[PDB]
Every structure is written in structure tokens, then in C-alpha cells.
Amino acid sequence: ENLPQLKSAVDGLTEMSESEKSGFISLVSRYLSGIEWSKIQTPTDEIVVPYEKMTPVSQDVAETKNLLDKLVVLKLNGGLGTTMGCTGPKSVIEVRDGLTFLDLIVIQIENLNNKYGCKVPLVLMNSFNTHDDTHKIVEKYTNSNVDIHTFNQSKYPRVVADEFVPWPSKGKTDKEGWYPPGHGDVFPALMNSGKLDTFLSQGKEYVFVANSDNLGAIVDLTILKHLIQNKNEYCMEVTPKTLADVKGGTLISYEGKVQLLEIAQVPDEHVNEFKSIEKFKIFNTNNLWVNLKAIKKLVEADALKMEIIPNPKEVDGVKVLQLETAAGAAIRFFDNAIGVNVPRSRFLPVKASSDLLLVQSDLYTLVDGFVTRNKARTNPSNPSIELGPEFKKVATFLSRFKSIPSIVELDSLKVSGDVWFGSSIVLKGKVTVAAKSGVKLEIPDRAVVENKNINGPEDL
Known part of the structure; x- marks a missing residue:
């Protein structure tokens, strides 16, 4: 409880960078400080643009190619395969015909670069659980026609729930003492890594972010063209809710802003309403298109204050707290932010x-x-x-x-x-x-x- 004792313990953790210490303390601060259901508004075509309403690319190729010279493709690669009984990064599970998720990803980008003569970079956001393995795996692509960047996202200390102290401060300094604090961390990590500024210097303008296990997240130039033409600094791909998707995060209007709303932010009395697919008709795919200059501005300004998600776990019989954020929740901080309602072909998760x-x-x-x-x-x-x-x-x-x-x-x-x-x-x-x-x-x-x-x- 309180602030500076926690802050002293965290500054004691010589494993953490300065940016990590500051980022974690900022999450703890907001979590310990603290959505009115009745102030929620359903979105419209003014916030969520139907993919059909969007203007297709013109048959003129140099246009396609001008679109692609501005693009960076990023895959979230911080998850292990252990949910599916496999060691190593989730992305190295074979999906089909002997090829991994990451194999398919490299091939897609390589073929884009072949078809169009562009040089679209791939970046993988790893975690401390996947970074070293990934570094070794990606050598396999050395002769591939794609520049592959990797960076490690933040590593925060698990917090002992009862005592509210960092678990590493109690001597739990091996991998089990820490966690990667969600994919919301992609933004500060892309900045903290140096990669953002890199891509900026080269005249990249947008990043397309997606889960490495969504087989449907392929580059779509209708979407990107729309963002450039309408100056949308962020665009979430959403897709209609079937009964399989009732718990999925959805887009709302709240205090004048497009916002992602998740079940966690929803009171007990209201979850049944949240789960009604006639009321809330769409869900976040985690396919996200974001302007790079806007990321840099917002991270540098310490603007990105996404909802904190507790995620408690019990580890070796110790209950801990893992404070994390979601990448889609950043949508509320970006100028001219929108959802695009897309065909489910763009959401094929494994x-x-x-x-x-x-x-x-x-x-x-x-x-x-x-x-x-x-x-x-x-x-x-x-x-x-x-x-x-x-x-x-x-x-x-x-x-x-x-x-x-x-x-x-x-x-x-x-x-x-x-x-x-x-x-x-x-x-x-x-x-x-x-x-x-x-x-x-x-x-x-x-x-x-x-x-x-x-x-x-x-x-x-």
C-alpha cells in the first residue's frame, strides 16, 4: 500500500532498466489510485467503419507500392506454447504442411516484397520467455527477402498479493519472479527498444500489429489507404460477434472517445448485458493499425494510460498479481481513432x-x-x-x-x-x-x- 516503499523496493531491482522501473511504478500508481455503465454508448458507422464502405485501391500499382513503403508489420510473439503442451514460443508450433506460424509470416512478407518490389520490415515483439529462443530460430531466415527485427518487451516483477511487495525483492529472482505486462506494452517497448525511431528515420509511417497466431492477419491495403486519406492515427479491426465471441472486448463511445470495453471493466449486474450480441455486436480481433509518429508522441508524453488488468496467478503456492495492459485499449489516446468492421476471414486464431x-x-x-x-x-x-x-x-x-x-x-x-x-x-x-x-x-x-x-x- 501507499507509493514510495513500493518504489524503493522496485528501484532496488537491479535486473530492471530505468524505463522498466518507471513504467511499472506508473502502473502500480494508477492501479492503487483507480467505467460508469450508464455513460456507455453503442458505436456507429461514424466510429466503426464497415470494411465494404471503404474505398478500394485503384488498379494503379505504384499506389499499392507507395502504400507499402510506409508500412511496418509487427507480430506479438511474447507467448509460450505451454497452453498447447509445447515448449518454446507459441509461434514455432507447426500449423500446416510442416510450416510454423512464423514460417508463414516470413513467406507472406517475402511474397509481398516480391510481388511489389517493396522492402516491408517484420518486427517480432518477444518477452523474456521467448526472446532468446526466437533470436536463435530467426537465423533460419537469413537469406529470406525480409528484414526481421526483434525486441524484448518489458519485464515487470510479480507482486506478492498478501504483502504487496515485488516477489524478486523476497529473493524470487529466477524467471518465475517476473512477467511480461500484456501486449499494451508494445507501445512503450517499441519506443524503449529504439526500433520506433529507426523506422521513423526511414520514412515508415504506420505499423500493423497482430497476434502471431492469427492466421487471418494479412496486409490489407484498403484499410491502410483509408487511414492515410482520413488521417486516422489508429484503427482497430473488429468483426461481428457470434455466440462463440460473447466475452470478447468491444468498441464503445465513452466520454466523447472511442474506447475498448472488456468484461473486466463491467460490473457483475451488467455482464449478462455485456454478453448480449444484439447489444454489443462486434469484438476486437487484435489486428491494429497505428501511426508511428503518434506512438512516439504519446509514449514520450507519458500519455498512454491504459486500463490496468490485475491477472492474479498462484505460483509455487504463492498468490501473485501481474499488472498488465492491452494494446487495443490504447485506442482512446489516438487522434481520429476508428474501428473497421471486417470479414471473419481476418480472424483465424489457433x-x-x-x-x-x-x-x-x-x-x-x-x-x-x-x-x-x-x-x-x-x-x-x-x-x-x-x-x-x-x-x-x-x-x-x-x-x-x-x-x-x-x-x-x-x-x-x-x-x-x-x-x-x-x-x-x-x-x-x-x-x-x-x-x-x-x-x-x-x-x-x-x-x-x-x-x-x-x-x-x-x-x-
Whole structure:
């Protein structure tokens, strides 16, 4: 509690840079100091521009090329693969045809630079959990036609919840004593790293930020052209909420400003209202387009005061607090800030096993680096896929599917218990496989499983 005792402890932490100490103290200050639901307003086409209403690029190529000379592409790469049972950066999990997320990213940018003769740089924002591994991995791209920059974001101390002291101040100085404080940190870190000023000197004007695991976040020149023509200093890509997205962060008007609103800022009495997709119709994809000169101005001015997100964790039986911020929450600080409501093709996340099943099946293919949806697929929606904990770890997932089944005509798959799948299986309509406790169920090679429940070996 209070300020200067915490500040003294933090200044004691010789692992932290001066900019890190100051940044962390600033978060703690605002968190300890402190959205009225009734003052919230639903957005309109004046805040959220439909992607269709935007003016397409003209057939004139030199225009496309002038747009691309101003662009820097940034991928958020601070997350480990441990949620999916893998060591190393999440971005080095193989997504399809043997290629990692990062492989696809390098290939896309290389092909942009080929198609158009531009020199679009890639930058990866790493964390202390991914920085060294990433540094070694990216050597593989040495001869690739893309300049790849990396920088490490901030490293803040986990705070012991009960005592409110930095955990490293109590001797917990190994990796478990610290955390990367969210992707909101991308802004000060891009500044603190020196990279922002670099890109500035070269006449770059915009950065396109996206999660390294969103397969849909490809350079879109309609969006960028709009920002230049309308002087929008920030643009969030949003997409309509389906029932799968009810908890997603959304864009509102609040005290005269476009703002991101997340469930955390929403009172208990109001969460059900928040979750209504007729009320709040769109959600943040984390595909963000931001003006570089505006970042520099706002970071230098100490203007970016995003909502603090507690994120408490229990680590080795010690409850800690991890104060973090979100990159989309910065939207309220930028001049002429907007959302662009985009097709869901631009939001294809891999967060679990079930998403790999999506993108590794015949429902998609690699075309020139792009995870391209099968044209045969009649329904504009992807099948719903649910798997038990048996399928959580990627390697176990891959072993439980002798080959990935065809899902091109699938509507829905649910799998529970100890289930194994043979090769060349085809899945259609609504499929359920449910192995009871103590039972292992194996689905034979070349099975066609169609609008059917499988609750035992007695379902052939």
C-alpha cells in the first residue's frame, strides 16, 4: 500500500532498466489510485467503419507500392506454447504442411516484397520467455527477402498479493519472479527498444500489429489507404460477434472517445448485458493499425494510460498479481481513432488443439504462404470443434489422428474420453464421439462418420 516503499523496493531491482522501473511504478500508481455503465454508448458507422464502405485501391500499382513503403508489420510473439503442451514460443508450433506460424509470416512478407518490389520490415515483439529462443530460430531466415527485427518487451516483477511487495525483492529472482505486462506494452517497448525511431528515420509511417497466431492477419491495403486519406492515427479491426465471441472486448463511445470495453471493466449486474450480441455486436480481433509518429508522441508524453488488468496467478503456492495492459485499449489516446468492421476471414486464431484440426484438414490449403479456405466449402462458417483434455497437447493430438480427417462437409464435431482416429476418415454434419470412463474407442481407417453419435464400440 501507499507509493514510495513500493518504489524503493522496485528501484532496488537491479535486473530492471530505468524505463522498466518507471513504467511499472506508473502502473502500480494508477492501479492503487483507480467505467460508469450508464455513460456507455453503442458505436456507429461514424466510429466503426464497415470494411465494404471503404474505398478500394485503384488498379494503379505504384499506389499499392507507395502504400507499402510506409508500412511496418509487427507480430506479438511474447507467448509460450505451454497452453498447447509445447515448449518454446507459441509461434514455432507447426500449423500446416510442416510450416510454423512464423514460417508463414516470413513467406507472406517475402511474397509481398516480391510481388511489389517493396522492402516491408517484420518486427517480432518477444518477452523474456521467448526472446532468446526466437533470436536463435530467426537465423533460419537469413537469406529470406525480409528484414526481421526483434525486441524484448518489458519485464515487470510479480507482486506478492498478501504483502504487496515485488516477489524478486523476497529473493524470487529466477524467471518465475517476473512477467511480461500484456501486449499494451508494445507501445512503450517499441519506443524503449529504439526500433520506433529507426523506422521513423526511414520514412515508415504506420505499423500493423497482430497476434502471431492469427492466421487471418494479412496486409490489407484498403484499410491502410483509408487511414492515410482520413488521417486516422489508429484503427482497430473488429468483426461481428457470434455466440462463440460473447466475452470478447468491444468498441464503445465513452466520454466523447472511442474506447475498448472488456468484461473486466463491467460490473457483475451488467455482464449478462455485456454478453448480449444484439447489444454489443462486434469484438476486437487484435489486428491494429497505428501511426508511428503518434506512438512516439504519446509514449514520450507519458500519455498512454491504459486500463490496468490485475491477472492474479498462484505460483509455487504463492498468490501473485501481474499488472498488465492491452494494446487495443490504447485506442482512446489516438487522434481520429476508428474501428473497421471486417470479414471473419481476418480472424483465424489457433488457441488450442481444435483449431489445428480446422486448419490442417482439407478445409484449408497453403497458397503462396496463405492459409486459404477451401472454395468447395459451402457454408461461410467453420465447423464447431470440441475435444477433451486427452487432445490438449499438440503431440498427443497428432497421435490421436492417424491422418487429419476430411471436415469440408462437417457442421460440428464433439469428442470426449479416450478416443483415437484412423487415417482417411471423413466427417460430415453433426458428429459426436464419447468414450465412457475406462473405455478406449478407436475409429477405423476410412470410416465415413455422418450425423451420428458414437458412445461405444457398439456404434460400429
